Design a protein around this ligand. Structure first.
Ligand code: NPB
Length: 358
């Protein structure tokens, strides 16, 4: 890697790993379309296994960007419409409160207060239906944004219904394979287990626990190499061969709502570039990223804007991830760690590196 990139990276990530006590980390910088990889520490502290370009990390909510694009591809295929009522895909949703709640509200967290987490008690499809049927909205649809797994999770489950394929099946065949993400999984197979890094929470080795709508909201596991291709694909969608996937990517980066100087896409979140580091950095803290915030609809949605800072944070009990890219500069970064450390720290490091490369 050019000495320039190599220096900016090590000068920034080294103290980060030290301050945050991160056991292992993988970083990919996409500069002028080409990726450069950096690895540090352990994937397994006990067995002294190093982090490599083949190590699998839990992406946590970065998975939502995959769900948004899969949803965007289904729209391009004409299988679903974001303007459709949710009941069109789940007729059993009889509760009257589901009246004017569209797939758009679900995908963008603007349904009216759906909870951040689906209760652990919800284990069956019947449990899920009861949960949603009994849910009492706090606000009218399209008025407030409340980051929620139960919102985008449902959007993912419903978006694949017409296709007759399971969520994992549709993700693999419509997104993973066409993009050559051959080491990206929802369920890591035995053959890949040895590359599955351990997450660390308070010194204990952990992996994400099974849960309702986990695949759809936070279940993807991937390597730094596949994540770099993921970013390349989102930077230059017009270079993707699949027509509907190319369109789906563009739809996920469109701006449907605005809150502060942040815009909500499908999974992805955007800000105008150049961007005030404080705007992102401070907005990341899980005290502002999860809170209730009024939204302004952008009617009609603005098509993917090249001059944007597109990103998404993700975390599970033992992993912390972050992705950010600027289409206009063909610049991007991916940071995967097996320790869930503060979001502001992630955004700060990402900004420093990316700002330095223009
Ligand atoms: B995402 O990482 O913000 C996220 C993830 C989970 N999870 O359990 O993995 C819950 C809420 C948000």
């Amino acid at each position: 890697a050019p000495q320039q990139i190599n220096d900016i990276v090590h000068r920034t990530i080294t103290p980060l790993i030290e301050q945050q006590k991160i056991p292992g980390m993988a970083v990919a910088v996409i500069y002028q379309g080409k990726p450069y990889y950096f690895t540090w520490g352990y994937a397994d502290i006990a067995k002294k296994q190093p982090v490599t370009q083949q190590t699998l990390f839990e992406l946590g909510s970065v998975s939502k960007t995959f769900t948004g694009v899969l949803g965007g591809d289904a729209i391009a295929r004409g299988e679903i419409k974001l303007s459709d009522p949710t009941t069109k895909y789940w007729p059993e949703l009889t509760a009257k409160q589901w009246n004017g709640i569209t797939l758009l509200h679900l995908a963008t967290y603007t349904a009216g207060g759906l909870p951040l987490q689906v209760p652990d008690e919800v284990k069956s499809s019947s449990d899920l239906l009861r949960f949603y049927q009994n849910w009492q909205p706090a606000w009218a649809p399209g008025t407030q944004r409340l980051y929620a797994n139960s919102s985008i999770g449902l959007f993912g489950a419903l978006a694949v219904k017409p296709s007759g394929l399971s969520f994992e099946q549709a993700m693999q065949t419509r997104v993973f394979q066409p993009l050559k993400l051959n080491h990206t999984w929802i369920n890591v197979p035995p053959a890949e287990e040895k590359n599955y890094a351990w997450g660390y929470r308070e010194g204990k080795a952990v992996h994400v626990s099974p849960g309702a709508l986990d695949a759809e909201a936070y279940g993807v596991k991937s390597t730094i190499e596949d994540m770099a291709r993921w970013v390349q694909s989102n930077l230059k969608p017009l270079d993707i061969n699949e027509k509907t996937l190319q369109q789906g990517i563009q739809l996920a980066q469109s701006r449907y709502w605005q809150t502060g100087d942040m815009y909500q896409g499908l999974g992805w979140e955007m800000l105008d570039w150049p961007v005030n580091p404080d705007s992102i950095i401070n907005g990341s803290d899980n005290k502002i990223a999860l809170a209730a915030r009024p939204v302004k609809a952008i009617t009609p949605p603005t098509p993917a804007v090249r001059a944007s800072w597109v990103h998404k944070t993700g975390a599970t009990g033992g992993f912390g991830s972050y992705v950010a890219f600027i289409p206009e500069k063909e610049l991007g970064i991916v940071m995967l760690a097996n320790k869930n450390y503060p979001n502001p720290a992630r955004v700060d490091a990402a900004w420093q590196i990316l700002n330095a490369l223009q």
